[PDB]
């Protein structure tokens, strides 16, 4: 079926590095240089107050839509990732249901400016105060701190490519039918990320990477806050939340 479902040689692991990095460049949504250049474009006091005065449901709908836009690029990344399409449809759905949000949160660090603690949202950079109308402050500050700790690692685009590939191909996700096939794909992607870090003298970041439970805590926080919003405005979720967002975070 696929070469990376078996034990790969050094040269094949080298091909995998290049393959993962190509897949990511083609699906990274926004180019890094565009995000970096736009760092000077920050929302004014007036604009921040405008977002803060928006109704809770209005802000929830905008954030869910933007998050769905990013997730779509992650689905495209998985489709182009070596071996993912060779897995069964059950296992592809399992991996994306559990990992799409985690990949988006990793990818988000590119759009985060550590210097002034701002994130890129709807054309400009804004601090966490911009999201106050959502009424989920703990979760917003948890995403900002996570973006901050990743930003401190000074990830290259190639590093994000290889790390996110590994975030997606997790053989420990509950519900995987072909666990051994996934285990082997993960082991080769692991070798590819660690080979690239070795080749770029970047192995010092391995101990500095966040624990797996941290990304899981952020996804659990997001699902818990959505359920709270759902009880308050159920028809907002039912009529105006994107169908892909509902399929991943509420259950269809």
């Amino acid at each position: 079926e696929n070469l990376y479902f078996q034990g790969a040689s050094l040269t094949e692991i080298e091909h995998l590095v290049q393959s993962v990095c190509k897949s990511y460049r083609e699906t990274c949504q926004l180019r890094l240089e565009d995000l970096l250049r736009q760092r000077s474009n920050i929302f004014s006091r007036e604009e921040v107050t405008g977002y803060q005065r928006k109704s809770m449901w209005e802000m929830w709908e905008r954030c869910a839509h933007h998050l769905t836009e990013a997730i779509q690029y992650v689905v495209e990344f998985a489709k182009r990732l070596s071996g993912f399409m060779e897995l069964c449809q059950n296992d592809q759905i399992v991996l994306l249901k559990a990992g799409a949000m985690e990949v988006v949160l990793v990818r988000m660090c590119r759009a985060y400016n550590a210097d002034n603690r701002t994130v890129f949202f709807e054309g400009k950079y804004g601090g966490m105060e911009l999201f106050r109308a959502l009424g989920c402050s703990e979760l917003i500050s948890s995403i900002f701190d996570f973006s901050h700790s990743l930003s401190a690692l000074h990830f290259s685009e190639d590093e994000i490519a290889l790390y996110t590939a590994l975030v997606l191909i997790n053989a420990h996700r509950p519900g995987l039918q072909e666990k051994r096939k996934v285990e082997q794909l993960q082991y080769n992607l692991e070798l590819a990320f660690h080979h690239h870090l070795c080749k770029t003298h970047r192995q010092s970041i391995l101990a500095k990477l966040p624990p797996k439970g941290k990304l899981r805590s952020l996804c659990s926080q997001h699902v818990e806050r959505l359920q709270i919003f759902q009880h308050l405005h159920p028809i907002v979720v039912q009529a105006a939340f994107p169908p892909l967002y509902k399929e991943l975070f509420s259950g269809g």
Binding site: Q72, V75, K79, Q89, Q92, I93, L96, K97, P243, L244, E247, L248, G252
Partner: peptide, 10 residues
């Protein structure tokens, strides 16, 4: 529904 469709659309 949506995820199955995205994965099938080549």
């Amino acid at each position: 529904k949506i995820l199955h469709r995205l994965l099938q659309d080549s």
